[PDB]
Amino acid sequence: NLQNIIYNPVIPFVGTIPDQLDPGTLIVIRGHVPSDADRFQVDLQNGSSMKPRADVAFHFNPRFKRAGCIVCNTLINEKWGREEITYDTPFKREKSFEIVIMVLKDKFQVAVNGKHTLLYGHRIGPEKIDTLGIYGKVNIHSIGFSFS
Ligand SMILES: OC[C@H]1O[C@@H](O[C@H]2[C@H](O)[C@@H](O)[C@H](O)O[C@@H]2CO)[C@H](O)[C@@H](O)[C@H]1O
């Protein structure tokens, strides 16, 4: 029901994903937003190069300034694509969360605390994703996977 679990990773976190993100796969991320957070992000990456920066198939980016939002996008050859902004965000400073990223055939389906949050259509085949990055102001209790 959950495997390859990593606990209290240091942020910034970069880790290799154990198996392939095929339709049906869940990525489960539990954490807490620090009282002073501006933003954090979960990036599903093709590799871990820093310079040049690895491509990001799915960038999921809660932001806390202003009214708060989540920005999602894809990074290819160090250039961002079209931004998808979700203004109804469940994240709050000083509150804990369970993010479930469900890989479907045509998109990611993301829920927080069991409530649907957003959809993100695949722009790169998810089979090419091999690295998970978590950056910014966030505390992560655990990262787990359930494949297929
Ligand atoms: O698209 C994700 C990417 O956005 C960058 O910031 C954008 C911003 O989100 C956009 O709404 C604003 O109007 O212009 C900025 C130009 O880049 C971030 O810098 C980056 O880290 C990603 O989050």
Author numbering: 14 to 161
What is written in the article reporting this PDB entry?
Galectins are a family of proteins with some specificity for β-galactoside binding at their carbohydrate-recognition domain (CRD). Tandem-repeat-type galectins, like Gal-8, contain two distinct CRDs that are covalently connected via a peptide linker.
In structures 1–3, the N terminal tail (Gln9 to Ile12) forms a rigid loop, whereas in structures 4 and 5, the N terminal tail (Gln9 to Ile12) forms a small β-strand F0. The Rfree values of the C2 structures are higher than our P212121 structure, especially the Rfree value of the PEG400 structure. This indicates that cryoprotectants do play a role in determining the quality of Gal-8 N crystal structures.
